[PDB]
Design a protein around this ligand. Structure first.
Ligand code: SKD
Length: 661
């Protein structure tokens, strides 16, 4: 840092009693710009607590103060208030903090920059920028009328301690300068987590959701994710599937690449609005991919990744449930196309990509190549790309002058697919260094049924055979997709479930050879399971796990078969929020398998962080060194208050002894 602190202090215990630092700090504040650097712990916070306050403590000036505050939800924020100036700034972001990790309080590193030159207030926690707000009328934190108290662990208002804190401030420093983003990056951190995917990386997505992890036979650990461009919204949106891998047991990760991507819309790093009027803004004319899952095939050595594919403007909410998008002729399914100007789907994509007119029974001069792009007499047709912006005060989607290959999933294509959901497949023969062009899977539930929905996370490679299984769901059932030929062909195995309209996200473990247990999200508040004892051909009725709570809408749950005995027994590890309130209270739950009846004793619960801190979708894998890697959404991804947060999908490394303590 280019300058020394005006005040520095440490080892402050905040035990619901403020610490007055007025005489040490107030007369050292000068000029209109300041930086606060604070290292602090709060593993048992109050509902709302102030970590640092500067206030006018006198009668009649209760709303003249600056504070750095946090909530027991993990939210961090500031207030900057002066009643005489008529200013009441409040800037915050949910899900910004860690509480505990491996049972010990985490030291959070907070950096707040108040910059009078740029009229901007910026907050970083744990190296992540969580807000940056420019104002028309700047209020220097010292310029609040009548400030006479500087306080740790409360704000002194009219002589009383408000917003009392429980925690500790291990170090706090203030500077009479707005330090640069570059200087900020030099401040040491004590983070319990890593980032694999992050804002500003090669994906240029500012948001991520739906993590996966899979340990490959080489020892490489692979991860896939939704790179979500238009905020954290599900499709309809612009979303690509990105991947990254680690060759050192998760200590470092490769720069992401794409496994599946569309180019109808630019890859733009956009700061999606979080205000109540605009937060529902959703990219509406882009094709997308959503919800990926990985498996490795022993025979071929291929890595196989599946994901849902959504045509332009389509998502689960508006996909046509009564149309697969294929025509069966006869025994073979051919992708249907509608040509601009036709009200009906007159075409199919036949062998060799030939576009065939169903009404005239003649091939046309158009072909669809292996990238689902349209050619006419062998030449590639193009469309103009779109970009998005909020410069007009609402979301605008507009052509940007760049030509890209015309794809049948695009809004502007001459030939367009049925507006329903599909599933696609890509393979890698180099363990994630590159991905082949995706191919659509066929329909499994007939001509007049939309795609099933891929369960995000892992597929299952049965240990003693060549069988691969990917779970998917639809209304009234799980639909397991089974391949015995390295993913060249798939058949379904349907397993009825006693819920309609469930997002029945399911993950599988092989308890022993040929015996599969599937754990899945329900609408009941409990995680369900079912068992197959014939390698997925047939499935039991549904049972429920006791000792874990979910919300009524549920959350995805990840599950693995651990390779080593725990307490002399075979073990399964589940990862899920454990809360009836929200997507919070993340846990790993270790289940010991009864060798006589395949029942599971859920003997250990490990809290990922505080019960009140967010935890949503998750990925777990046994790393080659027998550690457990967890990549998870550290926020409430259902909440309409926690939309569009950056750098909340995070990675941690745990050992079994951390879980069973
Ligand atoms: C294909 C798709 O939309 N997948 C979604 C669904 O699940 C999630 C969720 O957070 O619950 C996130 C997934 O990415 O939101 C969706 C909702 O539940 C409707 O199924």
């Amino acid at each position: 840092l280019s300058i020394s602190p005006i005040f520095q202090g440490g080892s402050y215990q905040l035990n619901n009693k403020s610490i007055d630092i007025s005489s040490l700090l107030l007369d050292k504040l000068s000029g209109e710009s300041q930086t606060v650097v604070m290292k602090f712990k709060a593993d048992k916070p109050n509902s709302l607590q102030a970590l640092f306050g500067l206030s006018n403590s006198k009668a009649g000036f209760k709303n003249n103060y600056f504070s750095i505050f946090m909530r027991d939800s993990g939210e961090i924020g500031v207030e900057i208030r002066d009643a005489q100036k008529g200013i009441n700034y409040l800037f915050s972001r949910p899900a910004s903090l860690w509480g505990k990790h491996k049972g010990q309080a985490v030291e959070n590193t907070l950096v707040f920059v108040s910059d009078s030159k740029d009229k901007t207030y910026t907050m970083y926690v744990n190296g992540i920028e969580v807000f940056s707000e420019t104002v028309d009328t700047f209020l220097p934190i010292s310029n609040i009328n009548g400030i006479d108290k500087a306080t740790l662990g409360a704000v002194n208002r009219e002589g009383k301690e408000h917003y009392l804190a429980k925690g500790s401030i291990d170090e706090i420093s203030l500077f009479n300068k707005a330090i640069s983003d570059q200087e900020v990056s030099t401040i040491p951190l004590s983070n319990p987590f890593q980032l694999i995917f992050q804002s500003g990386d090669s994906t240029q997505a500012n948001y991520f959701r739906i993590p996966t992890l899979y340990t490959l036979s080489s020892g490489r650990v692979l991860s896939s994710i939704d790179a979500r461009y238009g905020g954290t919204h599900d499709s309809k949106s612009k979303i690509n599937i990105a991947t990254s891998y680690s060759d050192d047991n998760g200590k470092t990760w490769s720069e992401p690449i794409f496994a599946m991507k569309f180019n109808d819309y630019e890859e733009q790093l956009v700061y999606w609005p979080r205000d109540n009027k605009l937060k529902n803004s959703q990219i509406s004319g882009s094709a997308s991919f959503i919800d990926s899952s990985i498996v490795e095939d022993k025979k071929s050595g291929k890595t196989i990744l599946l994901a849902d594919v959504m045509p332009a403007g389509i998502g689960n909410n508006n996909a046509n449930k009564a149309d697969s998008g294929f025509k069966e002729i006869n025994g073979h399914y051919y992708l249907k196309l509608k040509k601009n100007g036709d009200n009906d789907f007159r075409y199919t994509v036949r062998e060799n990509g030939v576009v065939y007119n169903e009404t005239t029974n003649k091939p046309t001069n158009y072909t669809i190549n292996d990238k689902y792009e349209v050619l006419e007499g062998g030449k590639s047709l193009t469309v103009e790309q779109y970009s998005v912006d909020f410069d007009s005060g609402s979301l605008r989607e507009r052509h940007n002058g760049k030509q890209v290959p015309m794809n049948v999933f695009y809004k502007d294509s001459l030939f367009k697919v049925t507006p329903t959901n599909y599933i696609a497949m890509t393979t890698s023969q180099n363990r994630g260094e590159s991905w082949e062009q995706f191919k659509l899977l066929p329909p499994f539930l007939g001509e007049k049924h939309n795609g099933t929905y891929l369960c995000p996370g892992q597929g299952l490679a049965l240990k003693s055979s060549n069988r691969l299984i990917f779970a998917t769901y639809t209304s009234g059932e799980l639909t397991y997709l089974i391949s015995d030929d390295s993913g060249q062909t798939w058949k379904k195995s349907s397993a009825s479930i006693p819920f309609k309209n469930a997002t029945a996200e399911a993950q599988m473990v092989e308890l022993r050879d040929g015996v599969i247990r599937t754990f899945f999200r329900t609408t009941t508040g409990k995680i369900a399971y079912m068992t197959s004892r014939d390698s997925g051909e047939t499935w039991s009725k549904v049972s429920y796990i006791d000792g874990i709570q979910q919300t009524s809408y549920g959350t995805q749950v990840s599950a693995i078969k651990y390779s080593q005995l725990i307490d002399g027994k075979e073990a399964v590890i589940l990862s899920t929020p454990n809360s009836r309130s929200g997507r919070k209270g993340g846990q790993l739950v270790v289940g010991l398998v009864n060798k006589e009846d395949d029942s599971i004793d859920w003997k250990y619960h490990y809290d990922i962080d505080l019960p009140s801190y967010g935890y949503a979708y998750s990925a777990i894998t046994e790393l080659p060194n027998h550690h457990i890697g967890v990549l998870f959404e550290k926020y409430d991804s259902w909440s309409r208050n926690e939309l569009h947060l950056s750098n909340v999908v995070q990675y941690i490394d745990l050992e079994i002894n951390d879980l069973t303590k």
